[PDB]
């Protein structure tokens, strides 16, 4: 690390490359929560038979007096399945994947399946591009992922049928999971030790700012294709600017090529302008500097002490992500504009990050998790209880509960590293991030329980954070306590 200071700490290279590597995370939110728009559900009712010489004589009504989304009259007034398809409202959404290939009534769930698959890609991409980034390096893999996100995200916009769309969303989410992974690593291994913490919050705030981008881009371009394309097309640019990057000098050392560690540090010293210092640098200096440094997930499940942490922490991450996507993947039904709420959610995350930070230091870490979760679960239970007519009340509670889940994410990311000792911290935090994604796969699969009982997803998304708030009690406090190095510690 001292060397980094020798070649110029937080130098221009640390301004230029760090801006360019964080700029793609402005579209991560867009991609993850895109279907709220590209897969929005316009008011749909069945199409009559052309044989008929309006809708009054051929569509049954429900208790609201609106023409039914699943049936149509067999004779001009028995009801039948709608063989000629459906008529969708060309108002808010001119075309969506729900309108394009009919993901409605019987295929009501196929739209959630896509999100599940996208998120199956996001689970796989943390594993695949984690291993490939240790072998090929951070920069390469990032080059290949900016290419893959752009190609598969453009081929999703030009997919002729839903199965091919689901395959290209899985490839897009896999590349984006390797981007969200290796953007931090490449931005942490090039900046000094006391500024590492500032890189991880910058990344968290730039994701929150990407919601505002999604709301404005989807309002300007509602059609799903011109929307899926416009969110994916900047990744071609990303790709062409990622060549110019410099590969991690830490990766070089560990992997072995200490001799690249020399060039890497010397170029960065030429960009920072302190070339003389790097000039002083040599291989002889590198042998002694990283001498010490240069010189498994089954442990968690072998050590009873470390299991305790693991099984407790695994729920927290799971429950935080599961109820987050359970309350964010349904903009509709809040009684208000689906774009406006996307702006309000992004804007509640912001003070949430602070007020979360204040309670994290003043009352302690452990209290936070339970507080954030418990209130998140209570807010989401109240959404399933309170009637649809109270639009402003369910909007206010959902926005509070979503901000409490953003406050939980920050809290668990800090708290989990303080709970694990140095020998299993990075491994156990990577396994914690693996449980959140599992939570993102299972969340759309619980949205399909709306067909059983309309409020049953909101009851499961509200019960799981309340159950997880009691699991924070089973973990110790870590406010003002020093970072453990061994399993004996604590």
Q: Which residues bind ligand X56 (CB under 6 A)?
A: 28, 180, 200, 203-204, 207-208, 406, 409-410, 413, 433, 436
Report in angstroms how near the CB of residue 414 gets to ligand X56 at its nearest: 9
Q: Are strands 86-88 and 72-73 parallel, antiparallel or unpaired?
A: unpaired
Report in angstroms how near the CB of residue 429 gets to ligand X56 at its nearest: 10
Pick between residue 179 and residue 281 the one whose CB is nearest to ligand X56.
179
DSSP-assigned beta bridge partners for residue 86: 46
Pick between residue 260 and residue 341 the one whose CB is nearest to ligand X56.
341
Q: What are phi and psi of 323, to 5 degrees?
A: -85, -25
Report in angstroms how near the CB of residue 215 gets to ligand X56 at its nearest: 16
Pick between residue 45 and residue 353 the one whose CB is nearest to ligand X56.
353
Of all residues in the shown chain, the one whose CB is closest to ligand X56 is: 204
Report in angstroms how near the CB of residue 370 gets to ligand X56 at its nearest: 18
Task: Transcribe 135-163 into DSSP letters.
Answer: HT-HHHHHHHHHHHHHHHHHHHHT-SSHH
Pick between residue 410 and residue 443 the one whose CB is nearest to ligand X56.
410
Report in angstroms how near the CB of residue 285 gets to ligand X56 at its nearest: 34
Three-class SS of residue 27? coil
In this structure, what DSSP letter does residue 388 have? T
Report in angstroms how near the CB of residue 300 gets to ligand X56 at its nearest: 18
Report in angstroms how near the CB of residue 209 gets to ligand X56 at its nearest: 11
CA proximity to 416, closest of 284, 312, 262? 312
Pick between residue 49 and residue 204 the one whose CB is nearest to ligand X56.
204
Environment class of 362 (CB within 10 Å of its CB; exposed 0-12, middle 13-18, buried 19+): exposed
| Cβ contacts of 89 within 8 Å, gap of 6 or more | 42, 43, 44
CA proximity to 411, closest of 440, 378, 374? 374
456-467 residues labelled b (16+ CB within 10 A) or e (exposed) = bbbbbbbbbbbe
Pick between residue 182 and residue 395 the one whose CB is nearest to ligand X56.
182
Q: Are strands 72-73 and 79-80 parallel, antiparallel or unpaired?
A: antiparallel
Report in angstroms how near the CB of residue 361 gets to ligand X56 at its nearest: 17
Residue 184 and residue 197 in contact, taking contact as beta carbons nearer than 8 Å: no
Environment class of 357 (CB within 10 Å of its CB; exposed 0-12, middle 13-18, buried 19+): middle
As given in the structure block, the two tokens for residue 261 are: 């560690």
Pick between residue 99 and residue 145 the one whose CB is nearest to ligand X56.
145
Helix 425-447 and helix 391-419, axial crossing angle in degrees, nearest 10: 160
- Residue 30's CB is within 10 A of a number of other CB atoms, namely 23
CA proximity to 93, closest of 103, 85, 105? 103
Pick between residue 208 and residue 478 the one whose CB is nearest to ligand X56.
208
Pick between residue 102 and residue 189 the one whose CB is nearest to ligand X56.
189
Report in angstroms how near the CB of residue 306 gets to ligand X56 at its nearest: 21
Report in angstroms how near the CB of residue 309 gets to ligand X56 at its nearest: 18
Pick between residue 203 and residue 424 the one whose CB is nearest to ligand X56.
203
């Amino acid at each position: 690390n001292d060397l980094l200071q020798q070649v110029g700490g937080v130098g221009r290279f640390q301004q230029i490359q760090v801006t360019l590597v964080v700029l793609p995370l402005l579209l991560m939110a867009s991609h993850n929560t895109l279907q709220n728009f590209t897969a929005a559900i316009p008011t749909h009712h069945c199409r009559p038979p052309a044989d008929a010489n309006g809708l009054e004589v051929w569509l049954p009504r429900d208790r609201q007096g609106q023409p039914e989304s699943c049936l149509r009259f067999t004779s001009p007034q028995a009801t039948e399945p709608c063989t000629d398809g459906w008529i969708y409202d060309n108002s808010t959404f001119p075309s969506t994947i729900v309108t394009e290939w009919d993901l409605v009534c019987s295929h009501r769930a196929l739209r959630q399946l896509a999100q599940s698959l996208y998120m199956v890609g996001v689970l796989l991409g943390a594993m695949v591009f984690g291993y490939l980034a240790d072998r090929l390096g951070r920069r390469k893999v990032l080059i290949l992922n900016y290419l893959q996100t752009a190609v598969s995200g453009t081929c999703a916009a030009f997919a002729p049928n839903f199965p091919i769309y689901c395959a290209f969303r899985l490839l897009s989410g896999m590349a984006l999971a390797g981007i969200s992974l290796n953007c931090m690593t490449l931005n942490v291994e090039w900046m000094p030790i006391h500024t590492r913490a500032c890189v991880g919050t910058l990344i968290g705030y730039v994701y929150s700012l990407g919601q505002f981008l999604l709301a404005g881009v989807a309002y300007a371009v509602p059609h799903w294709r011109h929307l899926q394309l416009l969110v994916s097309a900047p990744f071609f640019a990303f790709f062409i600017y990622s060549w110019f990057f410099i590969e991690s000098a830490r990766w070089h050392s560990s992997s072995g090529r200490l001799d690249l560690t020399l060039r890497a540090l010397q170029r960065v010293a030429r960009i920072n302008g302190k070339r003389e210092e790097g000039a002083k640098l040599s291989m002889e200096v590198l042998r002694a500097s990283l001498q010490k440094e240069l010189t498994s997930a089954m442990e968690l499940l072998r050590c009873p002490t470390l299991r305790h942490l693991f099984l407790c922490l695994s729920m927290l991450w799971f429950a935080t992500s599961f109820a987050y996507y359970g309350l964010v993947m349904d903009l509709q039904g809040f009684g208000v504009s689906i774009y406006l709420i996307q702006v309000i959610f992004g804007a509640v995350d912001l003070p949430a990050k602070l007020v979360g930070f204040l309670v994290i230091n003043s009352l302690g870490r452990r209290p936070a998790q339970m507080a954030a979760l418990l209130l998140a679960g209570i807010c989401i239970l109240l959404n399933g209880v309170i009637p649809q007519d109270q639009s402003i009340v369910r909007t206010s509670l959902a926005v509070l509960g979503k901000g409490c889940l953003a406050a939980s994410f920050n809290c668990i990311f800090l708290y989990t590293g303080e709970l694990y000792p140095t020998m299993i911290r990075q491994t156990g935090m990577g396994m914690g991030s693996t449980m959140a994604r599992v939570g993102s796969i299972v969340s759309p699969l619980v949205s399909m329980t709306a067909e059983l009982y309309p409020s049953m997803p909101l009851f499961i998304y509200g019960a799981v954070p309340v159950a997880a708030s009691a699991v924070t009690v089973l973990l110790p406090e870590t406010l003002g306590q020093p970072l453990p190095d061994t399993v004996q510690d604590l």
